Nucleic acid binder design. Structure first.
Length: 143
RNA sequence: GGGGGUGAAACGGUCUCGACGGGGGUCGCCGAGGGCGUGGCUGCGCGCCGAGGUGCGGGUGGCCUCGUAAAAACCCGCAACGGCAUAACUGCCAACACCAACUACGCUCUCGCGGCUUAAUGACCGCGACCUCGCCCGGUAGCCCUGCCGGGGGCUCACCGGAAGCGGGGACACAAACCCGGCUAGCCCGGGGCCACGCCCUCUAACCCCGGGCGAAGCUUGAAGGGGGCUCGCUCCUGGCCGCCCGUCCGCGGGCCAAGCCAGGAGGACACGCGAAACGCGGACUACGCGCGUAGAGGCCCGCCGUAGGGACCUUCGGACGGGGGUUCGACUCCCCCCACCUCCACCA
């Protein structure tokens, strides 16, 4: 369906700030999300950058047999002017509240976008002893 | 085996709200103290020799060219530089140290009886020692209080000793081999007077200090002065020397002074100064030597905004429907047409 979502932050983690970005991609992914595939892969980013390069994300290839696609979890440009794209960047390197795809989707005109945020929900902070039990019961179920 | 469903949530209005990459602006980064001279000064300039570099340069012999000409080298560096990146740790496998129960501890440092400190048990303390040390009194040797008034402070186990008082043991680690407290160093022999409006003989000082004497030998008082003994002119300052010629070199000329002498005067010292004159009109600047013309890395102005060049950035404009060509804003669709993988079709050798 042309609006779906990525639940890897909605029972697992969830957001502290939300943003969205258009993502150019080579047409070979379009029918698969428009029909009904979704993703849950761990996106990351690396970002001493002018824009904000996302690392990893499946829209899925469209398929019958082999088709003409190339792996979707490659780098993609992210639409938004540099200054407020630096607002999405503003906390991305804090290693604890971290970049997540929230909802892959298309706009009304059929071009692809991703709702994005920065999130946590397992533990108050990692690498502590105390709150790891809440990261394996609770933060794989609730939020 | 081929033809075609189809790889899009819109017949076209399909301008992902917003990326990039060319613009519109910039103009700071950006081969640069935002400049450069195709130009000028001082009676027409300027020297008496000297410049240059390999890719980018530190260094280095004046290699060498060689004056109508400021024209062609090199050892070594730059080469060297050990650059990773989120949101879920609790798993695999590992460990920790002194004493008097007893042999010195209260026992220094060779012996002998009691005590009783864990039984320190004849070494401590109350005491019995040859031989040495100490207190306390006496002597050769040591005495640099060398005045009197109260007391000649007064003697050292050094060299010898327990006698007039006495004690430990092989070390009880000394103070006197020079001392306290009062009168001007008294009592008294004796040296001597200098420096600050120059000093002292006279003076604020019985003239005096006090180095010093009797158990053994020689420098001052002064805060102020008329005259004298000392090194003095009381003490200093009035005119000849000297310092200087004004863009680089000078034609034509030549006086005075900050200040000591030789030598006269003036105030109370050497506490701080009484008016004749050092430059001025010009003679050149290779146009009077070797030379020529912008000499060849002096010193300041005058004239061209030196280009906005040399660069890279924002927003903003141009966008990914499997690719690939039409094209009124895109266009597997409206149309030509390439590949996946399926769906429909005329066949045995």
């Amino acid at each position: 369906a042309p609006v779906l979502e990525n639940r890897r932050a909605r029972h697992d983690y969830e957001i502290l700030e939300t943003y969205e970005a258009g993502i150019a991609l080579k047409g070979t992914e379009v029918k698969s999300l428009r029909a009904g595939k979704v993703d849950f892969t761990g996106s990351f980013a690396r970002f001493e950058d002018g824009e904000l390069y996302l690392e990893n994300l499946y829209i899925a290839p469209y398929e019958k047999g082999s088709y003409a696609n190339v792996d979707p979890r490659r780098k993609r440009k992210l639409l938004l002017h540099k200054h407020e794209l630096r607002r999405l960047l503003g906390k991305v390197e804090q290693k604890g509240l971290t970049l997540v795809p929230l909802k892959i989707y298309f706009n009304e005109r059929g071009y692809a976008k991703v709702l994005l945020g920065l999130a946590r929900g397992k533990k108050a902070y990692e690498k502590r002893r105390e709150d790891k039990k809440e990261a394996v019961r609770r933060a794989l179920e609730e939020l």
